Amino acid sequence: LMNQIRSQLAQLNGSANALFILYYTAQGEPFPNNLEKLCGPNVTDFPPFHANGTEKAKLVELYRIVVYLGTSLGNITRDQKILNPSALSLHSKLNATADILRGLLSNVLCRLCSKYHVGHVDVTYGPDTSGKDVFQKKKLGCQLLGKYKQVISVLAQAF
């Protein structure tokens, strides 16, 4: 099992950066000429993560991240369907990633509730960005994807 997540974590990374470009690409003006300014990893309260922690703790965080991630993604997808109904290479990767993330949840969770004794886990989902101005919905959706690619690469070097 600890090898399957090592693997999902793997793929994810294989397509993280790629998905990020797909998003900022579909946004069109003015994201491509102002990327480092609106797509910079900046997710405020993004699940914390320490690398030197007992394998058990690193799963608690991974879990709370993957949940704050998948949730954050779903929002991006419900928003892109209306915003860029044509961006399909993107509409797909979005789901494509959501799926893979779902598996990691049940896996990191099975290693938790199982040998280890965790049972419940508290996370407090992130923000429910929806009442903001469209430009905001796109920027954050972009900021999340950037941070995702920025920390996911860090997550693979720890399991």
Short mmCIF file of N, CA and C in Angstrom, two decimals:
data_model
loop_
_atom_site.label_atom_id
_atom_site.label_comp_id
_atom_site.label_asym_id
_atom_site.label_seq_id
_atom_site.Cartn_x
_atom_site.Cartn_y
_atom_site.Cartn_z
N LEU A 1 0.82 -1.20 0.00
CA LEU A 1 0.00 0.00 0.00
C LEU A 1 0.86 1.26 0.00
N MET A 2 1.82 1.34 0.91
CA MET A 2 2.69 2.50 0.96
C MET A 2 3.47 2.67 -0.34
N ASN A 3 3.34 1.68 -1.23
CA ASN A 3 4.02 1.79 -2.50
C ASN A 3 3.05 2.31 -3.55
N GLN A 4 1.75 2.09 -3.33
CA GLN A 4 0.75 2.58 -4.27
C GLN A 4 0.65 4.10 -4.18
N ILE A 5 0.65 4.63 -2.96
CA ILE A 5 0.58 6.07 -2.83
C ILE A 5 1.87 6.67 -3.36
N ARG A 6 2.99 6.00 -3.05
CA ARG A 6 4.26 6.47 -3.56
C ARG A 6 4.12 6.59 -5.06
N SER A 7 3.22 5.77 -5.62
CA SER A 7 2.99 5.77 -7.04
C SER A 7 1.98 6.82 -7.45
N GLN A 8 0.87 6.94 -6.72
CA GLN A 8 -0.08 7.95 -7.12
C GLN A 8 0.62 9.29 -6.98
N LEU A 9 1.27 9.49 -5.84
CA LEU A 9 2.02 10.71 -5.65
C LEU A 9 2.89 10.94 -6.87
N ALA A 10 3.43 9.84 -7.39
CA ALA A 10 4.29 9.90 -8.55
C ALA A 10 3.57 10.50 -9.74
N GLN A 11 2.63 9.74 -10.32
CA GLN A 11 1.87 10.22 -11.47
C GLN A 11 1.48 11.67 -11.30
N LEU A 12 0.69 11.93 -10.25
CA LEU A 12 0.27 13.29 -9.96
C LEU A 12 1.34 14.27 -10.40
N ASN A 13 2.51 14.12 -9.80
CA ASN A 13 3.64 14.95 -10.12
C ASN A 13 3.90 14.91 -11.61
N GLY A 14 3.79 13.74 -12.21
CA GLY A 14 4.04 13.66 -13.63
C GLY A 14 3.14 14.58 -14.42
N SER A 15 1.93 14.82 -13.92
CA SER A 15 1.00 15.67 -14.65
C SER A 15 0.67 16.97 -13.95
N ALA A 16 1.22 17.22 -12.77
CA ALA A 16 0.89 18.46 -12.10
C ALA A 16 1.26 19.69 -12.93
N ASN A 17 2.56 19.89 -13.16
CA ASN A 17 2.96 21.05 -13.93
C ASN A 17 2.17 21.14 -15.22
N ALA A 18 2.06 20.03 -15.93
CA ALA A 18 1.32 20.03 -17.18
C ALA A 18 -0.08 20.61 -17.02
N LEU A 19 -0.80 20.19 -15.98
CA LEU A 19 -2.14 20.69 -15.79
C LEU A 19 -2.12 22.18 -15.52
N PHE A 20 -1.13 22.63 -14.76
CA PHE A 20 -1.03 24.04 -14.44
C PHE A 20 -0.99 24.90 -15.70
N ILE A 21 -0.22 24.48 -16.69
CA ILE A 21 -0.15 25.26 -17.91
C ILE A 21 -1.49 25.26 -18.61
N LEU A 22 -2.14 24.11 -18.61
CA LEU A 22 -3.43 24.01 -19.25
C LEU A 22 -4.38 25.03 -18.66
N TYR A 23 -4.35 25.21 -17.34
CA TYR A 23 -5.25 26.18 -16.77
C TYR A 23 -4.90 27.59 -17.22
N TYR A 24 -3.70 28.07 -16.90
CA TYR A 24 -3.34 29.42 -17.28
C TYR A 24 -3.42 29.65 -18.77
N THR A 25 -3.45 28.57 -19.54
CA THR A 25 -3.55 28.74 -20.97
C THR A 25 -4.99 29.03 -21.37
N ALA A 26 -5.93 28.29 -20.78
CA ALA A 26 -7.34 28.48 -21.07
C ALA A 26 -7.84 29.83 -20.58
N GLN A 27 -7.21 30.35 -19.54
CA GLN A 27 -7.65 31.64 -19.02
C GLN A 27 -7.47 32.71 -20.07
N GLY A 28 -6.39 32.61 -20.86
CA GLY A 28 -6.15 33.61 -21.88
C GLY A 28 -5.72 34.91 -21.23
N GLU A 29 -5.91 36.05 -21.91
CA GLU A 29 -5.52 37.31 -21.31
C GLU A 29 -6.13 37.45 -19.92
N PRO A 30 -5.36 37.90 -18.92
CA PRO A 30 -3.97 38.33 -19.10
C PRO A 30 -3.00 37.41 -18.36
N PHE A 31 -3.47 36.20 -18.06
CA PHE A 31 -2.66 35.26 -17.34
C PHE A 31 -1.35 34.91 -18.02
N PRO A 32 -1.31 34.73 -19.34
CA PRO A 32 -0.06 34.28 -19.93
C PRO A 32 1.05 35.32 -19.86
N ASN A 33 0.68 36.60 -19.87
CA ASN A 33 1.71 37.62 -19.81
C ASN A 33 1.90 38.11 -18.39
N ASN A 34 1.08 37.63 -17.46
CA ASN A 34 1.25 38.04 -16.09
C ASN A 34 1.12 36.87 -15.14
N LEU A 35 1.75 35.75 -15.52
CA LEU A 35 1.71 34.52 -14.74
C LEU A 35 2.31 34.62 -13.35
N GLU A 36 3.60 34.90 -13.25
CA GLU A 36 4.20 34.99 -11.93
C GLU A 36 3.46 35.94 -11.00
N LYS A 37 2.53 36.75 -11.52
CA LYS A 37 1.81 37.67 -10.67
C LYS A 37 0.42 37.19 -10.26
N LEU A 38 -0.24 36.34 -11.06
CA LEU A 38 -1.57 35.87 -10.67
C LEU A 38 -1.64 34.36 -10.48
N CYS A 39 -0.56 33.65 -10.79
CA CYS A 39 -0.59 32.21 -10.60
C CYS A 39 0.53 31.79 -9.64
N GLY A 40 1.01 32.71 -8.82
CA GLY A 40 2.07 32.35 -7.90
C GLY A 40 1.55 31.52 -6.75
N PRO A 41 2.27 30.46 -6.38
CA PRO A 41 1.84 29.67 -5.23
C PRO A 41 1.54 30.59 -4.06
N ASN A 42 0.27 30.83 -3.79
CA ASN A 42 -0.04 31.72 -2.69
C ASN A 42 -1.21 31.28 -1.84
N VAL A 43 -1.76 30.09 -2.08
CA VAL A 43 -2.88 29.63 -1.28
C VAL A 43 -2.66 29.93 0.20
N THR A 44 -3.35 30.95 0.71
CA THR A 44 -3.18 31.34 2.10
C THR A 44 -3.14 30.18 3.08
N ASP A 45 -4.30 29.80 3.62
CA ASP A 45 -4.34 28.71 4.57
C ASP A 45 -4.30 27.35 3.89
N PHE A 46 -3.22 27.07 3.17
CA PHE A 46 -3.11 25.79 2.51
C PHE A 46 -2.49 24.79 3.48
N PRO A 47 -3.11 23.62 3.65
CA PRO A 47 -2.66 22.62 4.63
C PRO A 47 -1.15 22.58 4.84
N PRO A 48 -0.70 22.76 6.09
CA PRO A 48 0.73 22.81 6.40
C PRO A 48 1.41 21.48 6.14
N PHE A 49 2.73 21.47 5.95
CA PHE A 49 3.38 20.19 5.75
C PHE A 49 4.85 20.19 6.12
N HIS A 50 5.19 19.26 7.00
CA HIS A 50 6.56 19.14 7.45
C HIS A 50 7.16 17.87 6.88
N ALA A 51 8.42 17.90 6.47
CA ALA A 51 9.00 16.70 5.90
C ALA A 51 9.58 15.74 6.93
N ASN A 52 10.25 16.24 7.97
CA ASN A 52 10.83 15.36 8.96
C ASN A 52 9.87 14.99 10.09
N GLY A 53 8.89 14.15 9.79
CA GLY A 53 7.95 13.76 10.83
C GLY A 53 7.73 12.27 10.80
N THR A 54 7.36 11.69 11.94
CA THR A 54 7.12 10.26 11.95
C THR A 54 6.19 9.89 10.81
N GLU A 55 6.52 8.84 10.07
CA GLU A 55 5.67 8.44 8.96
C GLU A 55 4.19 8.65 9.25
N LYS A 56 3.75 8.36 10.48
CA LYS A 56 2.35 8.54 10.80
C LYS A 56 1.87 9.97 10.62
N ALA A 57 2.59 10.93 11.20
CA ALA A 57 2.17 12.32 11.07
C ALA A 57 2.15 12.78 9.62
N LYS A 58 3.15 12.39 8.83
CA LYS A 58 3.19 12.82 7.44
C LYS A 58 1.96 12.36 6.67
N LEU A 59 1.23 11.38 7.21
CA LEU A 59 0.03 10.92 6.53
C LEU A 59 -1.17 11.76 6.94
N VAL A 60 -1.12 12.24 8.19
CA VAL A 60 -2.19 13.09 8.66
C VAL A 60 -2.23 14.35 7.81
N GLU A 61 -1.03 14.90 7.57
CA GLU A 61 -0.93 16.11 6.78
C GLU A 61 -1.28 15.83 5.34
N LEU A 62 -0.63 14.82 4.76
CA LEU A 62 -0.92 14.48 3.38
C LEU A 62 -2.41 14.39 3.17
N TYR A 63 -3.07 13.71 4.10
CA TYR A 63 -4.51 13.55 4.00
C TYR A 63 -5.22 14.89 4.00
N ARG A 64 -4.93 15.69 5.01
CA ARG A 64 -5.59 16.98 5.08
C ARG A 64 -5.21 17.86 3.91
N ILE A 65 -4.11 17.56 3.23
CA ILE A 65 -3.76 18.38 2.10
C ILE A 65 -4.56 17.91 0.90
N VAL A 66 -4.50 16.61 0.69
CA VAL A 66 -5.20 16.00 -0.41
C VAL A 66 -6.68 16.30 -0.33
N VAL A 67 -7.21 16.54 0.87
CA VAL A 67 -8.62 16.84 0.94
C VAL A 67 -8.84 18.31 0.63
N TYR A 68 -7.93 19.14 1.14
CA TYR A 68 -8.03 20.56 0.86
C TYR A 68 -7.71 20.81 -0.60
N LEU A 69 -7.08 19.81 -1.22
CA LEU A 69 -6.70 19.92 -2.61
C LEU A 69 -7.86 19.53 -3.51
N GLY A 70 -8.33 18.30 -3.32
CA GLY A 70 -9.43 17.82 -4.13
C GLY A 70 -10.61 18.75 -4.00
N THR A 71 -10.91 19.19 -2.79
CA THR A 71 -12.02 20.10 -2.64
C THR A 71 -11.77 21.37 -3.42
N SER A 72 -10.57 21.91 -3.27
CA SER A 72 -10.22 23.12 -3.98
C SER A 72 -10.30 22.91 -5.48
N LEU A 73 -10.03 21.69 -5.92
CA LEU A 73 -10.08 21.42 -7.34
C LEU A 73 -11.51 21.42 -7.83
N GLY A 74 -12.35 20.64 -7.17
CA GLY A 74 -13.73 20.62 -7.58
C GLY A 74 -14.23 22.02 -7.88
N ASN A 75 -13.89 22.97 -7.01
CA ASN A 75 -14.33 24.33 -7.26
C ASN A 75 -13.80 24.84 -8.58
N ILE A 76 -12.54 24.56 -8.86
CA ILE A 76 -11.95 25.02 -10.09
C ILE A 76 -12.67 24.44 -11.30
N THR A 77 -13.10 23.19 -11.19
CA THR A 77 -13.79 22.55 -12.30
C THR A 77 -15.20 23.09 -12.48
N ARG A 78 -15.94 23.30 -11.40
CA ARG A 78 -17.28 23.82 -11.60
C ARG A 78 -17.21 25.21 -12.20
N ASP A 79 -16.09 25.87 -11.95
CA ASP A 79 -15.90 27.21 -12.46
C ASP A 79 -15.42 27.23 -13.89
N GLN A 80 -14.57 26.27 -14.26
CA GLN A 80 -14.08 26.27 -15.62
C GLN A 80 -15.14 25.81 -16.61
N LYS A 81 -16.06 24.95 -16.19
CA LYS A 81 -17.07 24.52 -17.14
C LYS A 81 -17.86 25.71 -17.67
N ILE A 82 -18.19 26.67 -16.80
CA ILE A 82 -18.94 27.83 -17.22
C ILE A 82 -18.05 28.85 -17.90
N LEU A 83 -16.86 29.04 -17.31
CA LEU A 83 -15.93 30.02 -17.83
C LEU A 83 -15.39 29.66 -19.20
N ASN A 84 -14.60 28.60 -19.28
CA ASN A 84 -14.08 28.24 -20.58
C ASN A 84 -14.65 26.92 -21.04
N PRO A 85 -15.87 26.93 -21.57
CA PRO A 85 -16.53 25.69 -21.96
C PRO A 85 -15.79 24.97 -23.07
N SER A 86 -14.82 25.63 -23.69
CA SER A 86 -14.09 24.97 -24.75
C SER A 86 -12.85 24.26 -24.24
N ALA A 87 -12.14 24.87 -23.28
CA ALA A 87 -10.94 24.24 -22.74
C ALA A 87 -11.20 22.81 -22.31
N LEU A 88 -10.95 21.87 -23.21
CA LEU A 88 -11.19 20.48 -22.87
C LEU A 88 -9.94 19.77 -22.38
N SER A 89 -8.78 20.00 -23.00
CA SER A 89 -7.60 19.34 -22.50
C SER A 89 -7.49 19.66 -21.02
N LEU A 90 -8.08 20.80 -20.66
CA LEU A 90 -8.05 21.23 -19.27
C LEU A 90 -9.19 20.62 -18.49
N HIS A 91 -10.40 20.71 -19.02
CA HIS A 91 -11.52 20.15 -18.30
C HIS A 91 -11.22 18.71 -17.92
N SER A 92 -10.49 18.02 -18.79
CA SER A 92 -10.17 16.64 -18.49
C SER A 92 -9.13 16.52 -17.39
N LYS A 93 -7.92 17.02 -17.62
CA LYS A 93 -6.90 16.92 -16.59
C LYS A 93 -7.45 17.30 -15.22
N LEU A 94 -8.34 18.28 -15.15
CA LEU A 94 -8.88 18.65 -13.86
C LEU A 94 -9.47 17.42 -13.21
N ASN A 95 -10.39 16.77 -13.92
CA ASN A 95 -10.99 15.56 -13.38
C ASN A 95 -9.92 14.51 -13.21
N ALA A 96 -9.21 14.28 -14.31
CA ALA A 96 -8.13 13.32 -14.25
C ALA A 96 -7.38 13.39 -12.92
N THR A 97 -7.10 14.60 -12.45
CA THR A 97 -6.39 14.74 -11.19
C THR A 97 -7.30 14.49 -10.02
N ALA A 98 -8.52 15.01 -10.09
CA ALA A 98 -9.43 14.79 -8.98
C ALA A 98 -9.54 13.30 -8.65
N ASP A 99 -9.67 12.49 -9.71
CA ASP A 99 -9.79 11.05 -9.55
C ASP A 99 -8.62 10.47 -8.79
N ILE A 100 -7.44 10.65 -9.39
CA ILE A 100 -6.22 10.15 -8.78
C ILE A 100 -6.14 10.59 -7.33
N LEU A 101 -6.58 11.81 -7.06
CA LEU A 101 -6.55 12.30 -5.70
C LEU A 101 -7.48 11.49 -4.81
N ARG A 102 -8.64 11.12 -5.36
CA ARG A 102 -9.60 10.34 -4.59
C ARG A 102 -8.98 9.04 -4.10
N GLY A 103 -8.24 8.36 -4.99
CA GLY A 103 -7.60 7.12 -4.61
C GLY A 103 -6.60 7.34 -3.48
N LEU A 104 -5.82 8.42 -3.57
CA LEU A 104 -4.85 8.70 -2.52
C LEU A 104 -5.53 8.91 -1.19
N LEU A 105 -6.74 9.45 -1.24
CA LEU A 105 -7.44 9.67 0.00
C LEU A 105 -7.76 8.35 0.68
N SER A 106 -8.42 7.45 -0.05
CA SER A 106 -8.76 6.16 0.53
C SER A 106 -7.53 5.34 0.89
N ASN A 107 -6.40 5.61 0.25
CA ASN A 107 -5.20 4.85 0.56
C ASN A 107 -4.55 5.38 1.83
N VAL A 108 -4.21 6.67 1.84
CA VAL A 108 -3.61 7.27 3.02
C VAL A 108 -4.55 7.09 4.21
N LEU A 109 -5.84 6.96 3.91
CA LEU A 109 -6.82 6.76 4.95
C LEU A 109 -6.80 5.32 5.42
N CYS A 110 -6.61 4.37 4.50
CA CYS A 110 -6.58 2.99 4.93
C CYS A 110 -5.32 2.72 5.73
N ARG A 111 -4.23 3.45 5.46
CA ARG A 111 -3.03 3.24 6.23
C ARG A 111 -3.18 3.91 7.59
N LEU A 112 -4.15 4.82 7.67
CA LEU A 112 -4.42 5.52 8.91
C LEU A 112 -5.34 4.70 9.80
N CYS A 113 -6.62 4.58 9.44
CA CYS A 113 -7.54 3.80 10.25
C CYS A 113 -7.00 2.40 10.52
N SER A 114 -6.12 1.90 9.65
CA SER A 114 -5.57 0.58 9.87
C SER A 114 -4.35 0.63 10.77
N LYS A 115 -3.48 -0.38 10.69
CA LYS A 115 -2.30 -0.40 11.53
C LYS A 115 -1.73 1.00 11.75
N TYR A 116 -2.05 1.57 12.91
CA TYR A 116 -1.59 2.90 13.25
C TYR A 116 -2.54 3.50 14.26
N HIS A 117 -3.82 3.24 14.05
CA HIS A 117 -4.83 3.74 14.95
C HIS A 117 -5.05 5.23 14.80
N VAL A 118 -5.92 5.61 13.86
CA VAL A 118 -6.21 7.02 13.67
C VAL A 118 -7.71 7.24 13.71
N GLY A 119 -8.46 6.32 13.11
CA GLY A 119 -9.91 6.42 13.11
C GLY A 119 -10.40 7.70 12.45
N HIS A 120 -10.56 8.76 13.24
CA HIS A 120 -11.02 10.00 12.67
C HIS A 120 -9.87 10.96 12.38
N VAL A 121 -10.12 11.92 11.51
CA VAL A 121 -9.11 12.92 11.20
C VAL A 121 -9.80 14.25 10.97
N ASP A 122 -9.29 15.30 11.60
CA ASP A 122 -9.92 16.60 11.45
C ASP A 122 -9.19 17.46 10.42
N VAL A 123 -9.95 18.17 9.58
CA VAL A 123 -9.30 18.96 8.55
C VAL A 123 -9.86 20.35 8.32
N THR A 124 -11.17 20.54 8.42
CA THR A 124 -11.74 21.86 8.17
C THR A 124 -11.46 22.30 6.74
N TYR A 125 -12.34 21.89 5.82
CA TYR A 125 -12.17 22.23 4.42
C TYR A 125 -11.75 23.68 4.21
N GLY A 126 -11.09 23.94 3.09
CA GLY A 126 -10.62 25.28 2.80
C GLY A 126 -11.73 26.25 2.45
N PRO A 127 -11.43 27.20 1.57
CA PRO A 127 -12.40 28.23 1.22
C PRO A 127 -13.41 27.79 0.16
N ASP A 128 -14.61 28.37 0.22
CA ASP A 128 -15.64 28.01 -0.74
C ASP A 128 -15.82 29.13 -1.76
N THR A 129 -14.70 29.50 -2.38
CA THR A 129 -14.69 30.57 -3.36
C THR A 129 -15.77 30.47 -4.44
N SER A 130 -16.79 31.31 -4.32
CA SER A 130 -17.87 31.30 -5.29
C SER A 130 -18.55 32.65 -5.39
N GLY A 131 -18.62 33.40 -4.29
CA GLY A 131 -19.26 34.70 -4.36
C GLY A 131 -18.28 35.79 -4.76
N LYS A 132 -17.11 35.41 -5.27
CA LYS A 132 -16.13 36.41 -5.66
C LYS A 132 -16.28 36.82 -7.12
N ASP A 133 -15.61 37.89 -7.50
CA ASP A 133 -15.68 38.32 -8.88
C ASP A 133 -14.98 37.30 -9.77
N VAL A 134 -15.58 36.99 -10.91
CA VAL A 134 -14.96 36.01 -11.79
C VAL A 134 -13.45 36.14 -11.86
N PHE A 135 -12.90 37.31 -12.15
CA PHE A 135 -11.45 37.39 -12.21
C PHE A 135 -10.83 36.77 -10.97
N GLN A 136 -11.47 36.91 -9.81
CA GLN A 136 -10.90 36.32 -8.62
C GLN A 136 -10.98 34.79 -8.68
N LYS A 137 -12.11 34.26 -9.14
CA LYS A 137 -12.27 32.83 -9.24
C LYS A 137 -11.21 32.20 -10.12
N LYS A 138 -10.75 32.93 -11.14
CA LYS A 138 -9.74 32.38 -12.01
C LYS A 138 -8.36 32.46 -11.40
N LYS A 139 -8.02 33.63 -10.84
CA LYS A 139 -6.71 33.82 -10.24
C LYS A 139 -6.40 32.79 -9.16
N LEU A 140 -7.32 32.64 -8.21
CA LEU A 140 -7.12 31.68 -7.13
C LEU A 140 -7.05 30.27 -7.68
N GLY A 141 -7.95 29.96 -8.60
CA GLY A 141 -7.91 28.65 -9.19
C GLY A 141 -6.54 28.46 -9.78
N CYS A 142 -5.92 29.56 -10.25
CA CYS A 142 -4.58 29.47 -10.81
C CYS A 142 -3.54 29.39 -9.70
N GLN A 143 -3.79 30.13 -8.62
CA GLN A 143 -2.85 30.12 -7.53
C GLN A 143 -2.81 28.76 -6.88
N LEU A 144 -3.96 28.09 -6.83
CA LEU A 144 -3.98 26.78 -6.22
C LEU A 144 -3.19 25.80 -7.07
N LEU A 145 -3.43 25.81 -8.37
CA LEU A 145 -2.71 24.89 -9.22
C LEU A 145 -1.21 25.09 -9.13
N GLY A 146 -0.77 26.33 -8.96
CA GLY A 146 0.66 26.57 -8.86
C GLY A 146 1.22 26.02 -7.56
N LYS A 147 0.50 26.25 -6.47
CA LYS A 147 0.96 25.74 -5.20
C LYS A 147 0.90 24.23 -5.21
N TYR A 148 -0.11 23.68 -5.85
CA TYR A 148 -0.21 22.24 -5.89
C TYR A 148 1.03 21.66 -6.53
N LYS A 149 1.42 22.21 -7.68
CA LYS A 149 2.61 21.72 -8.34
C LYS A 149 3.87 22.04 -7.53
N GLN A 150 3.81 23.11 -6.73
CA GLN A 150 4.98 23.49 -5.95
C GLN A 150 5.20 22.61 -4.73
N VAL A 151 4.13 22.12 -4.12
CA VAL A 151 4.30 21.29 -2.95
C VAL A 151 4.18 19.82 -3.27
N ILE A 152 3.50 19.47 -4.36
CA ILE A 152 3.39 18.06 -4.64
C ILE A 152 4.77 17.47 -4.92
N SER A 153 5.63 18.25 -5.55
CA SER A 153 6.97 17.76 -5.83
C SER A 153 7.74 17.56 -4.54
N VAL A 154 7.31 18.28 -3.50
CA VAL A 154 7.95 18.16 -2.21
C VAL A 154 7.40 16.95 -1.49
N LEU A 155 6.14 16.65 -1.77
CA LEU A 155 5.47 15.52 -1.15
C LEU A 155 6.02 14.19 -1.64
N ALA A 156 6.46 14.12 -2.89
CA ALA A 156 6.99 12.87 -3.41
C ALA A 156 8.34 12.52 -2.82
N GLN A 157 9.12 13.53 -2.45
CA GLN A 157 10.43 13.27 -1.88
C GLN A 157 10.35 12.87 -0.41
N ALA A 158 9.16 12.59 0.10
CA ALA A 158 9.05 12.25 1.51
C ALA A 158 8.36 10.92 1.81
N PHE A 159 7.93 10.18 0.79
CA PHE A 159 7.26 8.93 1.10
C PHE A 159 7.93 7.75 0.43
#
